[PDB]
Amino acid sequence: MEAKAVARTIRIAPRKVRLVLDLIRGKNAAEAIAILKLTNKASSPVIEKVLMSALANAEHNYDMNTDELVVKEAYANEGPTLKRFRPRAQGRASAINKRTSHITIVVSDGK
Amino acid sequence: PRVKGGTVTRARRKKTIKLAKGYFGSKHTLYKVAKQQVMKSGQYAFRDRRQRKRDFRKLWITRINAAARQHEMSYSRLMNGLKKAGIDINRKMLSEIAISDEKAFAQLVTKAKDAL
Amino acid sequence: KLHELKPAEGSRKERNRVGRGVATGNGKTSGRGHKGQKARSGGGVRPG
Amino acid sequence: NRSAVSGGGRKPWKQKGTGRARQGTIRAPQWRGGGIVFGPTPRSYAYKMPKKMRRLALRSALSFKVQVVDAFNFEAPKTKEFKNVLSTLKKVLVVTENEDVNVELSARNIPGVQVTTAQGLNVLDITNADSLVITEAAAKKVEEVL
Amino acid sequence: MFAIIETGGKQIKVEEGQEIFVEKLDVNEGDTFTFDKVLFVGGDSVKVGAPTVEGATVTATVNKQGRGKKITVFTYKRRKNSKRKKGHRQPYTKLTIDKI
Amino acid sequence: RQTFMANESNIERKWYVIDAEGQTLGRLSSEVASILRGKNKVTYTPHVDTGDYVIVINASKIEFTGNKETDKVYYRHSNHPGGIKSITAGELRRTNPERLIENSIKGMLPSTRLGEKQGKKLFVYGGAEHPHAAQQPENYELR
Amino acid sequence: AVPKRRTSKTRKNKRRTHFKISVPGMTECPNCGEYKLSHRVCKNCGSYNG
RNA sequence: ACCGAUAGUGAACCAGUACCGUGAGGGAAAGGUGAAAAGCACCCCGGAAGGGGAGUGAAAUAGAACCUGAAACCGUGUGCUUACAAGUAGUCAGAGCCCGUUAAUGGGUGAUGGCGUGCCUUUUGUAGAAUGAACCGGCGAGUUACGAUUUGAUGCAAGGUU
RNA sequence: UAACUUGGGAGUCAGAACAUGGGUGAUAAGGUCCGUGUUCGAAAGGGAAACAGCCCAGACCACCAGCUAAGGUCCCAAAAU
RNA sequence: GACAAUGGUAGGAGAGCGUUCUAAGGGCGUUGAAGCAUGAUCGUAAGGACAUGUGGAGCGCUUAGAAGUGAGAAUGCCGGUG
Known part of the structure; x- marks a missing residue:
């Protein structure tokens, strides 16, 4: 059927994550983990975690073969941003947005 | 008593955003640009009804003139042929009669040249 | 009658x-x- | 208003070199938390009108009621007795003489019934009522008054 | 076999079995109605036209009597605080042309 | 109401061929542009090209009037600073007549997206031989 | 300088047309059984054998 | 015929408190699960967080970042359309393609053609290269007391009125 | 078919160009000051390419009807090669 | 019926819509109120209904009365977000 895994308040910017998520969307689940292990980006490990949890939820709660599971969807959504401040010069000060993201992945057999 | 403005501003602004859909970009999202473009739309529509009348008048004259030239006349010489032979039909009907029946428009052109 | 009251026509204005x-x-x-x-x-200047 | 809200009395910034709008206090109306431009003030609402118009309004209310029982006899205040008295005869205005303090008590608990006396006939009381139950004496006292 | 009927200060090229839309006529729903302002008749049949053909007429069944889509009439003068909104549902009557 | 509009399946298009020998340039160009936009025909609608394909031949033979051969300088700018070019009609009639007649005609058609469709229905040859034998071109005389 | 006019969210996405990152250019290891990255040591089990 | 969390006290919350100042002194933001904690036992992925089931529950997209949950804004998917074209982005006409309503001359898109230099303010006169507005949401400006004056209504009338 | 009177209520006291009679200037100025008129101000529509004031003409609203106005009829661009 | 009028800035006059509350009357509502989302709906405008989702407990309607009664502009204030 379909099995999802969501990771919430992952402390990475969401458009530093959609870079990687634009790769493994539509792919098989084997090459997906291959890519997510081989890539240089810092979003790969957390997305490795999430995609492996998606596959495990499939094979444990829904019992669909972990051989034909294709990543139907994968997307990041914004989250609660931590707003910080940085001392500029001459007494000024500039905001900083330590933003977060919610990483959802949905693997489905396609049947 | 106190009367805090609630769900009365929203209602009319929503009413104005529904009214502007199909617009490029923030014209259909934002209110202070959607209102301006809705006003411009109303003014343009007011103007364009009158100009619609004018446009079709031009087009009818153009096609009647294209028909009469295939019958060795003008628009002007023909339309004087009519109204001097005997008062007749208007331009829209006369054009689409020249379109549908090529066989009655020449009836009229002979009866018009008969007006000399 | 207390739920149909009518002030005299012409008295009140908003x-x-x-x-x-x-x-x-x-x-x-x-x-x-x-x-x-x-x-x-x-206001303007004082009256007068 | 501005004079009453706490704090203020300090121009926030300098008015000239900041780049922000020029402000005078943080307790001005356009801010939040300071200043109501107009509004409520503790003030009365009553007014008057001539004696003759007052009396004519009371006469007109009774006139539209016309458009009367014997004396009430209630030793003890017993609301069921009063409910029976109202059923044998529900916006009732029971008008009595000076005051019978066993008919007001017998009747103040019934919803829709209002009791009063000939010296205390309102116009809101009358026009709120669907019926008038005035005694033989109260009819004569009000014919004497008005 | 068509014709040209003058109805409401406008000519209309009308054949049989056709539904037409005209400005408001006084008749009610589902009624006959004879057009006399016919300036030109005949297609493949004959080609006769006078100021008014005066021998031919048309007969139509009054199919319906209603009001068009509300067009809103908005207009404003910029920088001079003047604007004006109206509405308008132009009433029409639709007819079936029964015979010519 | 009823006003026939030309569609993609309504339209027809024809091929004409007009001798450009002995004709004044503009007196011919107006006729040709009329044909190109397509208002020799009764199914004229503005938002489509109901006009025809035209083949102007003998473009090395058009005639000017008065001192227009030596005068009537055509200019063109190259969008580089100071670079403007010029050519007189006499030198453009022997060097490139098929650009003389084309520029005359295309200045009489609108500058729109549909006016360029119509602009590229004109086929101009300096000579009496045009390779469009496979199109059934018709004679045409100046009305 | 400073931007004279705020950028639409059309021009933005057009400019981010090329903000992709390609895949690494990997292969499968004939020994490890899994995906390695070409011309590199196999992550999973050991050898290179080139 | 007082407010209802930007309101009402500066303070509905451990508030004259964080914080700011050498100091006198200035000064915030911060409410809501559920009828009842019944507040998620157990299993799986994970280092944990976080999830997916399984249960509590009337409801868990009521899971303590907890009543509804708008808009700006950020995304994923898809029906119509766009890489020879000069665009205050609409409006009138209009093929083609896709659907199917508060069922009535239907809805979405839009090849193409005609017309068309935003809004306020201030000015003799602004597309103006004069002002002002990043966008969204909320708050934000002729009021009350007492006198005078004229108008409408009402009540009496050489009297009227407290 | 307006006019005056007596009442309540205002706004205005920066005017502009065009024709015309003058002053000033230099028979300069889209200059400046006055008499008379028109339009803009507060006026959209058509023509003057574009263009408040120039010529025509005063928009209650709908119409895929007709007649004219300044101005025009080779093509762009409606109507006379 | 017939005729006549209906550009408009400062400004003058009239008629109205809508919001919160109050009185009276009469009603709807856990068989689902307010609100929010969508819609191809009715009115000359301000605007008024209706249907479906969401929501979970209060709201209309007539007639009057009283106003903290309507926001796009203040280098407006606070929050969020580009």
Whole structure:
């Protein structure tokens, strides 16, 4: 059927994550983990975690073969941003947005 | 008593955003640009009804003139042929009669040249 | 009768309320014309 | 208003070199938390009108009621007795003489019934009522008054 | 076999079995109605036209009597605080042309 | 109401061929542009090209009037600073007549997206031989 | 300088047309059984054998 | 015929408190699970967080970042359309393609053609290269007391009125 | 078919160009000051390419009807090669 | 019926819509109120209904009365977000 895994308040910017998520969307689940292990980006490990949890939820709660599971969807959504401040010069000060993201992945057999 | 403005501003602004859909970009999202473009739309529509009348008048004259030239006349010489032979039909009907029946428009052109 | 009351025809009028829109007639400047000593909150010169 | 809200009395910034709008206090109306431009003030609402118009309004209310029982006899205040008295004869205005303090008590608990006396006939009381139950004496006292 | 009927200050090229739309006529729903302002008749049949053909007429069944889509009439003068909104549902009557 | 509009399946298009020998340039160009936009025909609608394909031949033979051969300088700018070019009609009639007649005609058609469709229905040859034998071109005389 | 006019969210996405990152250019290891990255040591089990 | 969390006290919350100042002194933001904690036992992925089931529950997209949950804004998917074209982005006409309503001359898109230099303010006169507005949401400006004056209504009338 | 009177309520006291009679200037100025008129101000529509004031003409609203106005009829661009 | 009028800035006059509350009357509502989302709906405008989702407990309607009664502009204030 379909099995999802969501990771919430992952402390990475969401458009530093959609870079990687634009790769493994539509792919098989084997090459997906291959890519997510081989890539240089810092979003790969957390997305490795999430995609492996998606596959495990499939094979444990829904019992669909972990051989034909294709990543139907994968997307990041914004989250609660931590707003910080940085001392500029001459007494000024500039905001900083330590933003977060919610990483959802949905693997489905396609049947 | 106190009367805090609630769900009365929203209602009319929503009413104005529904009214502007199909617009490029923030014209259909934002209110202070959607209102301006809705006003411009109303003014343009007011103007364009009158100009619609004018446009079709031009087009009818153009096609009647294209028909009469295939019958060795003008628009002007023909339309004087009519109204001097005997008062007749208007331009829209006369054009689409020249379109549908090529066989009655020449009836009229002979009866018009008969007006000399 | 206390749920159908009718003041005598011609007695009451609703007050004039300026500075609310431009379709009433007294909205933008609110009946004061443009700039000047009398278009300022604080009245004009004293009477006389 | 501005004079009453706490704090203020300090121009926040300098008015000239900041780049922000020029402000005078943080307790001005356009801010939040300071200043109501107009509004409520503790003030009365009553007014008057001539004696003759007052009396004519009372006469007109009774006139539209016309458009009367014997004396009430209630030793003890017993609301069921009063409910029976109202059923044998529900916006009732039971008008009595000076005051019978066993008919007001017998009747103040019934919803829709209002009791009063000939010296205390309102116009809101009358026009709120669907019926008038005035005694033989109260009819004569009000014919004497008005 | 068509014709040209003058109805409401406008000519209309009308054949049989056709549904037409005209400005408001006084008749009610589902009624006959004879057009006399016919200035030109005949297609493949004959080609006769006078100021008014005066021998031919048309007969139509009054199919319906209603009001068009509300067009809103908005317009404003910029920088001079003047604007004006109206509405308009132009009433029409639709007819079936029964015979010519 | 009823006003026939030309569609993609309504339209027809024809091929004409006009001798450009002995004709004044503009007196011919107006006729040709009329044909190109397509208002020799009764199914004229503005938002489509109901006009025809035209083949102007003998473009090395058009005639000017008066001192227009030596005068009537055509200019063109190259969008580089100071670079403007010029050519007189006499030198453009022997060097490139098929650009003389084309520029005359295309200045009489609108500058729109549909006016360029119509602009590229004109086929101009300096000579009496045009390779469009496979199109059934018709004679045409100046009305 | 400073931007004279705020950028639409059309021009933005057009400019981010090329903000992709390609895949690494990997292969499968004939020994490890899994995906390695070409011309590199196999992550999973050991050898290179080139 | 007082407010209802930007309101009402500066303070509905451990508030004259964080914080700011050498100091006198200035000064915020911060409410809502559920009828009842019944507040998620157990299993799986994970280092944990976080999830997916399984249960509590009337409801868990009521899971303590907990009543509804708008808009700006950020995304994923898809029906119509766009890489020879000069665009205050609409409006009138209009093929083609896709659907199917508060069922009535239907809805979405839009090849193409005609017309068309935003809004306020201030000005003799602004597309103006004069002002002002990043966008969204909320708050934000002729009021009340007492006198005078004229108008409408009502009541009496050489009297009227407290 | 307006006019005056007596009442309540205002706004205006920066005007502009065009024709015309003058002053000033230099028979300069889209200059400046006055008499008379028109339009803009507060006026959209058509013509003057574009263009408040120039010529025509005063928009209650709908119409895929007709007649004219300034101005025009080779093509762009409606109507006379 | 017939005729006549209906550009408009400062400004003058009239008629109205809508919001919160109050009185009276009469009603709807856990068989689902307010609100929010969508819609191809009715009115000359301000605007008024209706249907479906969401929501979970209060709201209309007539007639009067009283106003903290309507926001796009203040280098407006606070929050969020580009």
